Amino acid sequence: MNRGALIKLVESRYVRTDLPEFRPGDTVRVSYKVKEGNRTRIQDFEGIVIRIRRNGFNTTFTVRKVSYGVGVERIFPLHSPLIQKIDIVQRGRARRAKLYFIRNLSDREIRRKLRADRKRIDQDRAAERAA
RNA sequence: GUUCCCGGGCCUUGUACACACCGCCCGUCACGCCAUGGGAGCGGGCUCUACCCGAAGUCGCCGGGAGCCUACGGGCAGGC
């Protein structure tokens, strides 16, 4: 038997292919489905992805932003049906795969440390030219 | 005999006494009221210095791996 195969099979019905690829350092807007009273709505979360744990279907990514003076980090499973869409708002360039270190930097230092990844920007504009 | 004790007469001298020496008056200790100083400290106001971070905005640089406008030796966006 192939135990790994069986797993991926069970998993397969929930796998998404529709979301955009993104790298740690990028700034992103995640439109998340949320429930309150009594309705469900779409609530946006916009920050830098500071980490990407990979485990196939169980890959999860972590996003950090400052909201009204306090730092907030959000963790999302990448194939969560509760995510409507993810919009890349900016490509950034880390030299490092996990970016825990920006937790201790000023807004100025971060801007210096994570410069726009101009390469993937042209690259994003190279597409976005449909036929 | 008039030194002494009581009372009085005259001159004089001292006085913070004049309710007039059966006058006045000082400080502690006890009690009560009020205010003030000190006092381990507690709380508040204002202020000074050094550094970290830093909105809007002006000003300066850039405006390219790069957008929009051309009025293209430019401008705006945008970045520092």
Ligand SMILES: [Mg+2]
């Ligand atoms: Mg496995």
Ligand SMILES: [Mg+2]
């Ligand atoms: Mg099989």
Ligand SMILES: [Mg+2]
């Ligand atoms: Mg006599």
Ligand SMILES: [Mg+2]
């Ligand atoms: Mg006589």
Ligand SMILES: [Mg+2]
């Ligand atoms: Mg006399």
Ligand SMILES: [Mg+2]
């Ligand atoms: Mg006497």
Ligand SMILES: [Mg+2]
């Ligand atoms: Mg006192």
Ligand SMILES: [Mg+2]
């Ligand atoms: Mg005092």
Ligand SMILES: [Mg+2]
């Ligand atoms: Mg004090």
Ligand SMILES: [Mg+2]
């Ligand atoms: Mg004080």
Ligand SMILES: [Mg+2]
């Ligand atoms: Mg310091």
Ligand SMILES: [Mg+2]
């Ligand atoms: Mg400064």
Ligand SMILES: [Mg+2]
């Ligand atoms: Mg130009």
Ligand SMILES: [Mg+2]
């Ligand atoms: Mg400008």
